[PDB]
């Protein structure tokens, strides 16, 4: 009415958020937009010049698109001027489509980034030969393609709507879901589960598995470098064979030139019968996963290996390294004792075996490891290598913590929007929801500035 009143009967759409909080959120938003712009750009710019950056570069793009596309509009029509929507029906359908499609791309990348890491650390014989530049290329194109398909429902759920008390007005046009609560409910759930819960489970599970493998590699390194011995020259095995390094069986052929011949199909130089320390650990890392694979494809060794902690797994690998998959699987009562976590019982029975009599000094160190779950029988260890272990664990935790700290309140807010029915919305829940809106999204935007810092420390 009036045609002379601009702010008409739109009182039911008003939001009572203070201008002081608006100033604070805008300042917080300006800080996040500045850091996130440079951080994601520098990561994206320096990339254009080991395919683990293709995922990092993909993540660096999606975080930047969130700051450039969704942040300005939200700062105007969702923070400062809640109504009316100043971008039309096409803008209403387009904004919520892109904001969700890019949110998927970030969440799916964060998951896919840790998937490649899991395939790089926990499985060295399935990735070194199977991943190509072409596979990783299209794998990322599928991430963006699936993210755009999952955001298609937003083109139908959202839309322009006039909620002014007057039949017609301009100040009543709002960008709100144009479907019933049941349809809004289903759309928000599938969105919430797919992005939030799929990564959160995939991120936290795979990262926990990565932390154990890295701890095993730190434990198995010193245990075998002490018992098996590190020798940079060719020496004769106890059984009369040619070995080198950390017990790298070269060949059973008695020809020394043939042993020198095979000694460098893996090393890559001519050497003339000598290798370096860094080369020995490369042969060691290959010989370790071979023992790990035989343990995993064995049904008599895997249940024991799974129930053991990181330290006791190294003791098992220590035994598999010396005797083989069959020789260790010959132990059948002790493995069941190790499976029941009866350490003192298993420690005594192994002291009866032939393997304990052949190498008494080493067997006690392996047995003592099964007793205490610590490597104290091998000393304190190398502090330089063991600290890099502690670094990577906290980084894996940071990736999990940042994803939940930044995106849990965001999805929780949208659940409030559709699950609190009409009868439960008091005046306080309305004002809280809009103050709650500022906090959840500032945390959501923070991931666009935090990720270029975390994932560039990996």
């Amino acid at each position: 009415t009036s045609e002379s009143d601009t702010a008409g009967p739109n009182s039911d759409l008003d939001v009572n958020t203070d201008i002081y909080s608006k100033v604070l959120v805008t300042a917080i938003y300006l800080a996040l937009f500045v850091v996130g712009t440079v951080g994601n750009s520098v990561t994206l710019f320096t990339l254009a010049r080991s395919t683990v950056h293709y995922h990092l570069g993909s993540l660096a793009l999606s975080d930047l698109l969130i700051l450039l596309l969704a942040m300005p509009v939200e700062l105007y029509n969702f923070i400062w001027v809640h109504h009316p929507w100043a971008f039309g029906d096409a803008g209403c359908r387009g904004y919520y489509f892109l904001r969700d499609a890019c949110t998927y791309a970030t969440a799916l990348n964060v998951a896919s980034l840790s998937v490649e890491r899991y395939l790089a650390i926990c499985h060295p014989f399935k990735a070194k030969t199977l991943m190509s530049r072409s596979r990783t290329k299209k794998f990322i194109s599928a991430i963006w393609l699936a993210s755009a398909l999952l955001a298609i429902p937003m083109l139908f759920t959202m839309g322009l709507q006039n909620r002014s008390a007057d039949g017609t007005h301009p100040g009543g046009l709002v960008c709100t879901p144009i479907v019933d609560t049941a349809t809004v409910k289903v759309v928000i759930q599938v969105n919430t589960f797919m992005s939030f819960l799929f990564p959160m489970l995939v991120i936290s599970i795979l990262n926990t598995v990565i932390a154990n493998k890295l701890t095993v590699m730190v434990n198995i390194f010193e245990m075998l470098r002490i018992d098996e011995g590190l020798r940079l020259k060719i020496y004769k095995d106890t059984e009369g064979y040619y070995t080198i390094g950390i017990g790298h069986l070269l060949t059973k052929s008695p020809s020394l030139n043939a042993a020198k011949s095979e000694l460098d199909k893996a090393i890559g130089r001519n050497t003339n019968g000598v290798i370096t320390k860094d080369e020995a650990e490369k042969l060691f890392n290959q010989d370790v996963d071979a023992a790990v694979r035989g343990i995993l494809r064995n049904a008599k060794l895997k249940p024991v290996y799974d129930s053991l902690d990181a330290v006791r797994r190294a003791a098992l690998i220590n035994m598999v390294f010396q005797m083989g998959e069959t020789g260790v699987a010959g132990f059948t009562n002790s493995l069941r004792m190790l499976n029941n976590k009866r350490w003192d019982e298993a420690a005594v029975n192994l002291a009866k075996s032939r393997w304990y009599n052949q190498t008494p000094n080493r067997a006690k160190r392996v047995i003592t490891t099964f007793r205490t779950g610590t490597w104290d029988a091998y000393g304190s260890g190398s502090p330089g290598r063991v600290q890099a272990l502690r670094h990577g664990v906290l980084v894996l935790r940071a990736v999990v913590i940042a994803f939940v700290v930044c995106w849990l309140p965001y999805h929780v807010r949208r659940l409030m929007f559709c699950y609190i029915s009409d009868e439960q919305w008091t005046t306080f829940l309305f004002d809280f929801y809009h103050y709650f809106y500022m906090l959840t999204n500032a945390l959501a935007y923070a991931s666009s500035a935090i990720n270029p810092i975390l994932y560039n420390l990996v």
């Binding site: 009409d422 309305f430 809009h434 809106y437």
Partner: peptide, 6 residues
């Protein structure tokens, strides 16, 4: 009054 901003 349910909110309209998602």
């Amino acid at each position: 009054r349910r909110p309209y901003i998602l």
